[PDB]
Amino acid sequence: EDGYDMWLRYQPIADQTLLKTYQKQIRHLHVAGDSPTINAAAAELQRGLSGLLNKPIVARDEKLKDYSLVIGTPDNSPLIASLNLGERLQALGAEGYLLEQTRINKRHVVIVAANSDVGVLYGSFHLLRLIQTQHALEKLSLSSAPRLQHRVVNHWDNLNRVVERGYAGLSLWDWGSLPNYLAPRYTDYARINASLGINGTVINNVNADPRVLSDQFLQKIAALADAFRPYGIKMYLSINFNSPRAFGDVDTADPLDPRVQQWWKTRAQKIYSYIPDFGGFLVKADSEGQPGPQGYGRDHAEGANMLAAALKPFGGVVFWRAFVYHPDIEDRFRGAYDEFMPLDGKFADNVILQIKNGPIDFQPREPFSALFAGMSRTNMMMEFQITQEYFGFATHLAYQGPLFEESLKTETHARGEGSTIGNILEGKVFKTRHTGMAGVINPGTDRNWTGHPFVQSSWYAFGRMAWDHQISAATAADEWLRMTFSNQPAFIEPVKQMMLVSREAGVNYRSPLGLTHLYSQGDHYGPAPWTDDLPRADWTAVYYHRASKTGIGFNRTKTGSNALAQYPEPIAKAWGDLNSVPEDLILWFHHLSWDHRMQSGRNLWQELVHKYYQGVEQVRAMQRTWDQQEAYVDAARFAQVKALLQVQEREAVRWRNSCVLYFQSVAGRPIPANYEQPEHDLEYYKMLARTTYVPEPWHP
Amino acid sequence: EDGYDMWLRYQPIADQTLLKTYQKQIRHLHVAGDSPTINAAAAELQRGLSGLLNKPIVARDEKLKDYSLVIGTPDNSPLIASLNLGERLQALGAEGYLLEQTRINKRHVVIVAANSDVGVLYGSFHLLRLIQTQHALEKLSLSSAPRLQHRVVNHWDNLNRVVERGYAGLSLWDWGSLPNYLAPRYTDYARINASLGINGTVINNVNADPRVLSDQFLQKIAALADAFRPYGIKMYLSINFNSPRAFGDVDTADPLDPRVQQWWKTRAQKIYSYIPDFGGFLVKADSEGQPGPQGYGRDHAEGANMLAAALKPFGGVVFWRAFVYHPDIEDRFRGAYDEFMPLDGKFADNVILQIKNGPIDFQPREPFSALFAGMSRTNMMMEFQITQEYFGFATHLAYQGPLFEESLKTETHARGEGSTIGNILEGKVFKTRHTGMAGVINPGTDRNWTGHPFVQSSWYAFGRMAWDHQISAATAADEWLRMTFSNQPAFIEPVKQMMLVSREAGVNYRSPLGLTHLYSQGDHYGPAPWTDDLPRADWTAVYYHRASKTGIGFNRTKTGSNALAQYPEPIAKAWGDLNSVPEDLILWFHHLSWDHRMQSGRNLWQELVHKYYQGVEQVRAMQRTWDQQEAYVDAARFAQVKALLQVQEREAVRWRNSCVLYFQSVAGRPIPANYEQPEHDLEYYKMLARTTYVPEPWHPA
Ligand SMILES: O=C(O)[C@H]1O[C@@H](O)[C@H](O)[C@@H](O)[C@@H]1O
Ligand SMILES: O=C(O)[C@H]1O[C@@H](O)[C@H](O)[C@@H](O)[C@@H]1O
Ligand SMILES: [Co+2]
Ligand SMILES: [Co+2]
Ligand SMILES: [Co+2]
Ligand SMILES: [Co+2]
Ligand SMILES: [Co+2]
Ligand SMILES: [Co+2]
Ligand SMILES: [Co+2]
Ligand SMILES: [Co+2]
């Protein structure tokens, strides 16, 4: 087990009694269709069922045999059509499916039925997943349809193949051999994502390279799109807003200039000539030095709509990112909301605003982005981070399922109770239909795709939750563990719990209690809570914590930056009152004296120290848990995860010591005597922050 | 087949009659020894014999059974000791071995015998290679010993894991998880190299990062050294000469300053505390902006000997590179020789001067470095390039065996006939202390290690030739093809010939007839023969070709730069006379009229055009040959190679068109009508040279 198969490990079912039951139920595979998508589904079931059932199961179009798996749509499978499923199939829409044990002409069958070929593909992966996770097929009757339209992955890949915030190898896209070489890995990539129902990929960096739009690269990109197409995955590209200028075709990129409008229209025509089902564009504009409409004195709707008009005739959409923040505003927290709220309703219907979970930048815990509860006439989609930019690159174990679930189940009170982020994303709160979730996965050429084996779990949870935003972190972990490692209950339970606590451990040894943005700049690998004196104050650490001798925290109430007024009144009320604000967010909104007493009975200084030490203890406990699993895991992945956890414990100690000593130097309070005192001083940790190997190929 | 096993593919022998013979001969595996190295040999034989013979063969220390493979030294194997092999075995030295079908206590056996445990490991790999290449074991009686002492690989790896002139992925060394995580791939890397007898590795870039010497990194590096040790591979590091300054410990790096001398002594003590058998240092100094003794007004012997003194108490060596050339000399070709000859005899005995094959920079064909025939009182070693910096990155097929053989068999006449480069390296010409060969391999994390499958063949040939410098490119290709793809004769023959022509094809479409250095600067991906106006003239293209309306070539005879006078007289004579100079080197030494008539009957302009067009035709023929092999190769590697050959053909056309049109613009002569006229004009190719995606993660400064 080198991890190349990820969670699609088609190994013989270990439970011998259960295996016999599956072998009795699925003796044949019946597939009448022959479209590329159905062929992909048939190929997956043939390899999957053959591996899991430990016998050759070959896809055939022959007279129906007893105990068959039968797949198709009413349009390509007369057997499925003969069942007259009607309304039951109608509720499934364009991507849903039905899995059911039933009878066709007295033959025992299990059907994978859908309206479309892609629905059949998704249903086929779910059928395999039921077997992978040792679920019974007897009396099976279930249907599912995705809750979000655009379920996409994002890759911050540069064309030189270095990945920005990439800890898993070089970019998968081998430009030097494209379009000529159709590497099997491109198909495996499609299989991995299709297994989760992901239907779109943005292959290139948001810090966008205009070359992706050149003929040379569109031909290369078309080969990738061709490989992804049978798996239902549309191709998307990040664009550079100054492309008309970069190509030397127009002397401006102003979206109101007709020559610019025309340049994009012609470029869209060129794209669709190579990729007739091209999805559209991802846009990072007027942010962190990336060009945009504001560079020409135009607004974000003017820029987005210009691109959207170029795509409209071809059915393309614009994912316009809301990650924008000017350095001269009072409070970066307020930035995106103040930029986009005035534009609510001004965007075309093929524009979707892509918004990070929180208003800062993927920090270990952030409150929900106020834009989600404020934009009522604009399509929106979520952007989550999977790659561990802020959770320890490829050496820390940090399952992100809990972060995603926490976000999705957050009640916003935007329009009564039930205004959860998930419900907003689904479109039910504000009544929009163009919906989605994007996940910044940044995998690479490492054999296991993600570097750290457990980053696979985060990619997994993300795709499951993009399909159904109410799926819990626990449910996704249970499936992933079964698929990736073992179905042994004695293994599943402790490892699931280890996964579930890992996110919180990552918060605790870095920045608990509402602290944030304490990382070394600009690499983000280790601690640097002392960081000050950068060209922009909002890229420093002290800007966020505002620690002094008397207190800590950032006042975002009415008496401070009043960012709380950007939220619905029930949220502003709950978070603005010290009696009701969650302690896990408190320092985002309140500047508190070090003597403030917390729910635990500790004062704030004591609670801060307790949290930092708790995070290290949580890592140590993960170490012990993992060591207990040696009998259930292959020796190679066991040894790898054991080793990485040692690296993580060492780094967590460095984080803890650096931060506790830093805040001690500012507060002037002792570390309570029960704790192991750091043996080195703050100056030593400032030296480790200069000399600690930053393990990433890309650099700021 | 994803190429991860490279040439150690232990799959069942396909010839069923032959398989049965092997199965009859090797029924058991007997190993009495238990040192780490013997254990590694035993594990290799267990997995190798089990795979090749398609039956479980487990290494055991039990009473000898009939039809056993028995391995060991007289010191660790009483069975081998009982044969009283004496002088025959002893003559094979510290790394050699004997493979022999014989009898012990009336049992039929095949022995893998050596004086040392590493000799047993090397012999075990040769035993497996005999089976992998379908050689008979009946009456087997062969011995071998390496002809060079230091058989080393070099990795131009940066600590961020980006590889300089690396076309095969990120650096293998995962610094973020070291030393804690002992990745299996580190052992597989040691197996690959040990299978060729490679006994050293320099893991980091010659453009050296001082951090490798920090305690933090030495701990990491020690884990790698630990993984490599059972396989006989010593660890070496490239050093930055300014390290005492970079560490903030000394305000100078002057090798004559006692504080500097002491810094390195203390540093060596720290290294050896982590890695007790550390091999030593590779040094790129006073070259291309890298620091060195000349920065302190000292010479390269003063610098090298300072480092060598630090290592001497621990048995370490300094590989001091001769790749040095100042921008203000009249002819770069003369540089290394003029720098180092005055220092011949001044280097300490644990210093070895590491010299590239040619005096420029790994160009597709270079004449031999004159230093090899001149330095008669200094230890020398060869440096060859495997990574295809100048042969097309990871997209062109270019087996380098012929380049290495061409070099090693070149007669230099240093001390009369028999003064081949190989014999010089072996120590037979000048009678020297330390010998060796280094190969810049630059593999990475790509599943197949080398990107292009065929780069594996170059690494293979390199290690084979480091063991025995008289091994031909053809022999190494025959072995490699058998081990990597197929033993079918109908496959081997045409693919071997394809491999053998591939180097020449790469010369032909880039820079034939003694032309050189026509690449895009500084990435080296594509053609740029017009390159002029760089900060240093010796980094341009025009500096080398000197093309004009009347002629082309660089005068290195007595009437020009007289670089020929740096060679032994018979070479200076042969190359300086137009009647005897090889046409494949001619423009290195002569500036010739475009009307000069070549051996073929063509004038020089016509010959130049013919060679550039021939190179493209040679790639097209490689495509046709490869297509004919579909039945013999697995579908995945077949498809990959087919596709890469398409990329190569397209790029070779770009090269051809760019260079022919460029030289045409200068000569003002027509491309003969028999040749297909380029798809576009010279200005268009000057545009493709700005627009053509450079497929490498690393970029020049
Ligand atoms: O989302 C973004 O555009 C940016 O997000 C930040 O988290 C990363 O540090 C930066 O590399 C990205 O370009
Ligand atoms: O040998 C060397 O030091 C140099 O060789 C040249 O061929 C390479 O362009 C350069 O990247 C190396 O550093
Ligand atoms: Co893994
Ligand atoms: Co980059
Ligand atoms: Co735990
Ligand atoms: Co206190
Ligand atoms: Co290969
Ligand atoms: Co670099
Ligand atoms: Co050929
Ligand atoms: Co002519």
Swiss-Prot record, chain B:
The protein's name in its UniProt record: Extracellular xylan exo-alpha-(1->2)-glucuronosidase
Protein family according to the UniProt entry: Belongs to the glycosyl hydrolase 67 family.
Subcellular location: Cell outer membrane
Stored Pfam families: Glyco_hydro_67C (PF07477), Glyco_hydro_67M (PF07488), Glyco_hydro_67N (PF03648)
Chain positions of site Participates in a stacking interactions with the sugar rings of 4-O-MeGlcA: W156, W539
GO biological process: glucuronoxylan catabolic process
Record-level GO cellular component terms: cell outer membrane; extracellular region
Result when mutating R321A: Loss of glucuronosidase activity
SUBUNIT field: Homodimer.
Active site: E288, D361, E389
Function in brief: Alpha-glucuronidase involved in the hydrolysis of xylan, a major structural heterogeneous polysaccharide found in plant biomass representing the second most abundant polysaccharide in the biosphere, after cellulose. It catalyzes the cleavage of the alpha-1,2-glycosidic bond at the non-reducing end of 4-O-methyl-D-glucuronic acid (4-O-MeGlcA) side chain of short xylooligosaccharides and releases 4-O-methylglucuronic acid. It can also hydrolyze small soluble oligosaccharides such as dobiouronic acid, aldotriouronic acid, aldotetraouronic acid, and aldopentaouronic acid.
Key words of the record: Carbohydrate metabolism, Cell outer membrane, Glycosidase, Hydrolase, Membrane, Polysaccharide degradation, Signal, Xylan degradation
Record keyword Signal present: yes
SUPFAM superfamilies: (Trans)glycosidases (SSF51445), beta-N-acetylhexosaminidase-like domain (SSF55545)
MF-aspect GO terms: alpha-glucuronidase activity; xylan alpha-1,2-glucuronosidase activity
Outcome of swapping V206G: Little influence on the glucuronosidase activity
Residues that, per the record, bind beta-D-glucuronate: N207
Activity control mechanisms: Inhibited by 4-O-MeGlcA.
Keyword Glycoprotein (UniProt): no
Binding site for substrate: E164, R165, K284, R321, R332, K356, E383, H517, W539
Catalysed transformations (reactions): Hydrolysis of (1->2)-alpha-D-(4-O-methyl)glucuronosyl links in the main chain of hardwood xylans
EC annotation from Swiss-Prot or TrEMBL: 3.2.1.131
Consequence of substituting D361A: Loss of glucuronosidase activity
Location (main, coarse): membrane
Mutagenesis / variant outcome for changing K284A: Greatly reduced the glucuronosidase activity
Effect annotated for changing K356A: Greatly reduced the glucuronosidase activity
